[PDB]
Nucleic acid binder design. Structure first.
Length: 78
RNA sequence: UUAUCGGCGAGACCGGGAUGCACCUCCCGAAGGGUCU
């Protein structure tokens, strides 16, 4: 049982005037409220199952599925 | 692929002391000699 863990990382480069124009008051740039709201650091955590192998059964062409699973950008999960 | 999206990140000397040294003979024997203006 491991948690697939996705976090917004608003680095200093992201939080810089070189990348956008924050609204200014007193000449100070209004810092982004990352603690919550529509502009928060989304800490999305999902359950995930970490087994050493995955398995499926299927009635299909072995060549095409081998090629797809080896070369197509497809994984197992959400 | 039961949906759609999300860098985890930022800072730090690990360093400071030490002799490894103190004792031993490797020696003991022999003819390389004889053939051709």
């Amino acid at each position: 049982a491991t948690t697939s863990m996705r976090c917004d990382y608003l680095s200093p480069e992201k939080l810089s005037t070189a990348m956008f124009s924050p609204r200014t008051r007193r000449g100070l740039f209004t810092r982004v409220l990352l603690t919550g709201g529509p502009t928060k650091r989304r800490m999305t955590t999902r359950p995930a199952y970490s087994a050493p192998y995955l398995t499926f059964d299927f009635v299909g062409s072995s060549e095409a599925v081998e090629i797809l699973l080896n070369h197509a950008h497809v994984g197992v999960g959400y």
